Amino acid sequence: GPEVRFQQQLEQLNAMGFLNREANLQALIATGGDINAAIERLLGS
């Protein structure tokens, strides 16, 4: 399934210093796997 997109995007976020898989998962699930609308949530929204 497309879960591989979400998983690899948690690592693109890991490189920036977002060192948590669960917060990164919820930030992408809140969009459907759009990462730029996920990054602003990890910044605090």
Binding site: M16, G17, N36, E40
Partner: protein, 76 residues
């Protein structure tokens, strides 16, 4: 001196800089070379925001150093 700007990561580019130059002028160099307004940009030093600190000398940013650049499209 010269640093590895990671633009969302994947794209890593060298940027030539002076330590005493302003982070305002670094935002302007990004803006005018890559065609993107500074409001869309955020500079991420290992999860910390670069803001209110003034220059690369103020933070003691140096050489061959891996500053992340987050950029925000207004949807699509």
């Amino acid at each position: 001196m010269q640093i590895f700007v990671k633009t969302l990561t994947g794209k890593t580019i060298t940027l030539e800089v002076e330590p005493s130059d302003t982070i305002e002028n670094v935002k302007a160099k990004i803006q005018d070379k890559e065609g993107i307004p500074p409001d869309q940009q955020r500079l991420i030093f290992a999860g910390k925001q670069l803001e209110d600190g003034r220059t690369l000398s103020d933070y003691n940013i140096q050489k061959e150093s891996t500053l992340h650049l987050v950029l925000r499209l207004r949807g699509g």
